[PDB]
Design a protein around this ligand. Structure first.
Ligand SMILES: NC(=O)c1ccc[n+]([C@@H]2O[C@H](COP(=O)([O-])OP(=O)(O)OC[C@H]3O[C@@H](n4cnc5c(N)ncnc54)[C@H](OP(=O)(O)O)[C@@H]3O)[C@@H](O)[C@H]2O)c1
Ligand SMILES: COc1cc(Cc2cnc(N)nc2N)cc(OC)c1OC
Length: 157
């Protein structure tokens, strides 16, 4: 099982200046719940942004840099390496990885952030022509979590 795991806004912004544009504790809990006990594949910049590997799952960083050898992180050097990892693999970002993988994955877990953020990094356009909504769940709003948001599980048709 290969899946995309992404949050993006109404214009498919995912990133600004190597961080998430929004503060949304609930999306990160969503991420924790989905990926715990499984495998994340991410690009180097995304990892640097996050600093350390997420506890309680396999962290895999795709990078060209032969000197990368960080404790708790496995490194891969080619996309083709992804297909050799066992178990449930989530493509974790960023833009380059989504572009390379979106035609390849079984499904996508997308948080739609119902807002318009200033961004420098984007999720690629897709159609629901190609993707079936297996589920759509409204995020609940509170004072911790103030941006409307929807969790989609999409499966390739
Ligand atoms: N909203 C979300 O769900 C979400 C999730 C993740 C990240 N983000 C955001 O996305 C942005 C970062 O994305 P980004 O696209 O700029 O960078 P990125 O995907 O985090 O990392 C790009 C780097 O990954 C490595 N890489 C990618 N494809 C490769 C390949 N085929 N072979 C070898 N190495 C490869 C390269 O590392 P080297 O240059 O070291 O070789 C490349 O420079 C940030 O703003 C971040 O906050 C958002
Ligand atoms: C869990 O913390 C982070 C997670 C992510 C990636 C990410 C965040 N949300 C969703 N829905 N999918 C993703 N792939 C990206 C981050 O920074 C760029 C994080 O730290 C702030």
């Amino acid at each position: 099982t290969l899946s995309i795991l992404v949050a993006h806004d109404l214009q498919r912004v995912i990133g600004f200046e190597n961080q998430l544009p929004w503060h949304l504790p609930n999306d990160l809990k969503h991420v924790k719940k989905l990926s715990t006990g499984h495998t994340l594949v991410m690009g180097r910049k995304t990892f640097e942004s996050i600093g350390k590997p997420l506890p309680n799952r396999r962290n895999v960083v795709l990078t060209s840099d032969t000197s990368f050898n960080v404790e708790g992180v496995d490194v891969i050097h080619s996309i083709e390496d992804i297909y050799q990892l066992p178990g449930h693999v989530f493509i974790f970002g960023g833009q380059t990885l989504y572009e390379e993988m979106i035609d390849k994955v079984d499904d996508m877990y997308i948080t739609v952030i119902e807002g318009k953020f200033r961004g420098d990094t984007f999720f690629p356009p897709y159609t629901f022509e190609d993707w079936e909504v297996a589920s759509s769940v409204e995020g609940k709003l509170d004072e911790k979590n103030t941006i409307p948001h929807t969790f989609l599980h999409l499966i390739r048709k």
